Amino acid sequence: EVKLLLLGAGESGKSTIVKQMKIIHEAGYSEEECKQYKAVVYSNTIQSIIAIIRAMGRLKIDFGDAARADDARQLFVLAMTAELAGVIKRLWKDSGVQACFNRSREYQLNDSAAYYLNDLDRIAQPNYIPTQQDVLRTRVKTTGIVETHFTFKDLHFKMFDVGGQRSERKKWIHCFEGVTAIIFCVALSDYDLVLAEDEEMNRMHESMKLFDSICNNKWFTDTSIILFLNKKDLFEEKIKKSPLTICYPEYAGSNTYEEAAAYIQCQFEDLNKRKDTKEIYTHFTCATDTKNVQAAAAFVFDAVTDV
Ligand SMILES: Nc1nc2c(ncn2[C@@H]2O[C@H](COP(=O)(O)OP(=O)(O)OP(O)(O)=S)[C@@H](O)[C@H]2O)c(=O)[nH]1
Ligand SMILES: [Mg+2]
Numbered sequence: 001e002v003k004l005l006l007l008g009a010g011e012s013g014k015s016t017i018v019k020q021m022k023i024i025h026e027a028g029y030s031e032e033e034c035k036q037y038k039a040v041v042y043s044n045t046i047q048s049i050i051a052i053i054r055a056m057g058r059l060k061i062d063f064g065d066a067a068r069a070d071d072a073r074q075l076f077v078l079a080m081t082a083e084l085a086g087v088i089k090r091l092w093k094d095s096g097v098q099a100c101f102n103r104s105r106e107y108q109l110n111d112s113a114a115y116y117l118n119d120l121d122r123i124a125q126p127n128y129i130p131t132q133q134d135v136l137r138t139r140v141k142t143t144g145i146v147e148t149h150f151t152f153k154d155l156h157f158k159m160f161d162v163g164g165q166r167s168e169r170k171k172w173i174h175c176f177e178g179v180t181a182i183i184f185c186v187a188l189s190d191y192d193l194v195l196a197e198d199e200e201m202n203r204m205h206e207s208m209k210l211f212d213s214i215c216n217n218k219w220f221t222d223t224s225i226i227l228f229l230n231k232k233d234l235f236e237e238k239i240k241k242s243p244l245t246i247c248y249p250e251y252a253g254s255n256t257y258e259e260a261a262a263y264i265q266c267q268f269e270d271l272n273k274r275k276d277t278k279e280i281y282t283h284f285t286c287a288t289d290t291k292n293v294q295a296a297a298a299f300v301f302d303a304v305t306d307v
Contacts, residue, residue, distance in 0.1 A: 001155065001156065002155055002156065002157045002158065002180045002181075002304060003157075003158045003160070003178050003179050003180045003181075004157050004158065004159045004160065004179075004180060004181055004182075004183060004300075005160045005162075005175055005176075005179045005181075005182050005183070006018065006159065006160060006161045006162065006182075006183050006185065007162070007164075007172065007182055007183070007184050007185070007210070007214055008164050008184050008185035008186060008207065008210070008228075009164040009165075009186075009187070009190075009195075009203065009206055009207045009210055010141070010163065010164035010165035010195075010196070010197075011111065011139070011164070011187060011190070011203075012164050012185035012186060012187055012207070012230060013185045013187060013228070013230040013231060013285075013287040014142070014161050014162070014164065014183075014185045015140070015142050015146075015161055016136055016287035016288060017161075017183065017185065017228070017287050017293065018146070018148055018159060018161045019135065019136055020136070020287065020290055020293040021148060021150050021159060021297070022148070022150075023132060023136075023290050024290065024293065024294055024297065025150040025151070025152065026150065028132055029132055029135055031129060034129045034130045034131070034132075034134075034135060035129055035130070037130045037134070037135045037138055038128070038129065038130055040130075040138045040140060041116065041123065041130050041134055041137075041138060042080045042123070044110055044112060044113075044116060044137075044138055044139055045088065045113075045116040045117060045120070045123065046075075046079055046080075046088075047110065048109060048110050048112075048113035048116065048117065049075065049088050049091055049092065049097075049113075049117060050075065050076070050079065051107065051108065051109050051110075051113075052091075052097055052100050052101055052104075052109065052113075053072045053075070053091065053097065053100075054107075055100050055103070055104075055106070055107040055109075056096065056097070056100050058106075058107065059100060059103060059106060059107070061096055061099055061100045061103075062096050063094050063095070063096035063097065064094050064095030064096045065094060065095075065096075068090065068091060068094050068096070068097075071087045071090050071091055072091060074087045075087055075088065075091065080123075080124065082124065085120060085121075085123075085124035088117070088120055089120050089121075089124075092117045092118075092120065101113075101114070102241075105192050105193060105242065108196050110139050111139070111189070111231070111234060112137040112138070112139065115137050116134075116137065132290070133288065136287070136288045136290075137288060141163060141165065142161060142162065142163040142164075142168070143163060143168065144162075144163075144168075144171070145160060145161070145162050145171060145174065145175060146160070146161045146162075147159065147160050147161075148161070152297075152301065153301075155304075160175050162175060164185075165196075165197060166197050167197070169210075176219045176220070179220065179223045180223065180224075180304060181223060181224045181225075181226055181300070181303060181304050182214065182220065182223055182224070182225050182226060183226045183228055183300065184210075184211055184214060184215075184225065184226065184227050184228065185228045185230050185287075186204075186207050186211070186227065186228065186229050186230060186264075186268065187203070187204075187207070187230055187231045187234075188229050188230065188231050188232055188234070188235035188261060188264060188284075189231040189234035189235045189238050190203035190204045190207060190231075191203075191204045191235075191242075191244055191246060191247035191264070192238075192242045192246040192247060202247060204247050204264075205247070208267070208268065208271065211227070211268055211271055212271045215271055215272050215273075215278075215280065216271070216272065216273045216274065221274070221278070224279075224281065224303055224304070224306075225272075225278065225279075225280045225281070226280075226281045226282075226283070226300060226303055227265075227268055227269075227280055227281065227282040227283070228282075228283055228285050228287075228296070229261065229264065229265060229268075229282060229283070229284045229285065230285045230286070230287050231286070231287070232257075232261065232284045232285065232286050233286045233288070233289070235257065235260070235261060236257040239255050239256065239257055239260050240255060242255075243255050244260045244263065244264075248263070248267070251263060261284060265282055265284075268280075268282070269282065281299070281303045283296055283299045283300075
């Protein structure tokens with residue numbers, strides 16, 4: 001009876017939200033289901049550390065220890081085993097690798113790269129099983145449309161998740177029929193990144209063009225628009241290191257979590273052309289934090305209840 005549509009750019013966090021609805025209302029991920037994602041965890045860790053040493057060549061950075069070159073060679077051939085763990089750990093500890101990691105803005109690196117790598121000892125053990133946090137931290141591109149059903153207070157939702165990348169936005173239109181509410185996810189940490197499809201397009205700017213399209217859409221003039229400003233935990237960490245001016249030349253405020261976030265929210269709310277007729281319900285979220293998403297869900301519920 002209630003249709004929920006998750007929209008947003010790629011890496012936005014929409015699929016992580018779906019995962020959280022199963023954790024909260026469907027009592028988590030079974031031990032067996034976690035073992036399913038074990039390969040995904042390993043693939044993500046491997047792809048991340050590969051992405052870093054590959055960046056070094058492009059970025060003119062070399063190891064703090066020249067002996068690592070044999071480990072970097074070993075990483076590619078092996079692409080889990082206890083030898084591969086020792087190789088990755090040494091590469092992650094290297095001063096050169098760490099320098100390149102702190103320049104990840106200049107290439108494409110998974111959000112959860114450091115999360116997995118900093119916990120490699122746990123990840124490398126035998127009989128290791130992905131934790132619920134580990135599963136949420138996994139990245140897998142969403143291809144096609146995925147639906148999910150859950151019931152709350154005698155109201156049950158149809159949640160639709162779709163791919164955010166340009167390759168999949170053609171299929172967004174197929175879902176627009178009968179949408180109660182839209183949850184538009186935006187990565188706060190995307191302000192200094194660039195799209196993986198287009199090397200020179202700013203990720204946040206892309207997210208903006210999308211939100212303008214959706215927020216001021218002809219089909220959705222009825223539907224309530226919810227704006228999820230996601231990845232606030234990464235934004236908090238990141239805003240100290242990188243200035244928000246990279247995304248906005250005009251921004252003269254401080255590079256602080258509270259003030260910078262407030263600014264991004266305002267720029268997205270300003271895209272509403274029917275600003276008097278239509279309201280936008282905005283919430284700051286950490287999609288990997290189940291407790292935080294529980295609070296978000298309640299906020300989503302209140303917006304739908306307002307009907
Ligand atoms: N730290 C942190 N990581 C997040 C957050 N939201 C998503 N991520 C991470 O970012 C990655 C992308 O999230 P995901 O849910 O897959 O985005 P998406 O919109 O579904 O990506 P796509 O299918 O359109 S391509 C995931 O691997 C997840 O672990 C967040 O709020 N905080
Ligand atoms: Mg997805």
